[PDB]
Amino acid sequence: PRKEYEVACNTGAYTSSGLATAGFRTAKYLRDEWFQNSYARYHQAFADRDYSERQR
Amino acid sequence: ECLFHREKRMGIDLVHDEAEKELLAEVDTILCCQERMRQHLD
C-alpha cells in the first residue's frame, strides 16, 4: 500500500533515493523528505501535550 | 532473503516491477495472517 505508493512516486529519469527492502537510506536527504520529517516530529510532541492535558 | 539478493543488481537494471510488488504483498499478507492467528489464539 503506502510502501508501493512511495516507491512508485519517484522512479523517473531523475535522481532517486536509496530506499529498498532493507538496509539504510543513504544520509543525503531531499527537501520534501526533510520537510515531512520536521512536520512529523512537530506534530508528535504537540499531540503529546493534549494527550497529557486530557488526563489533566 | 530473496528480496535481499534481488537488490544486488545495478546499472540500468534496477527496474521496479510486478515481482517486487508481489513480494511486498506476500510479506504484508504473512504479517496480517500471523496477526490474525495471534488474535484467534488470545
Binding site: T11, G12, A13 | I12, L14, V15, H16, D17
Partner: peptide, 6 residues
C-alpha cells in the same frame, strides 16, 4: 529511478 518501459 527506472520504469520498465524505457
Amino acid at each position: 529511478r527506472y520504469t520498465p518501459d524505457d
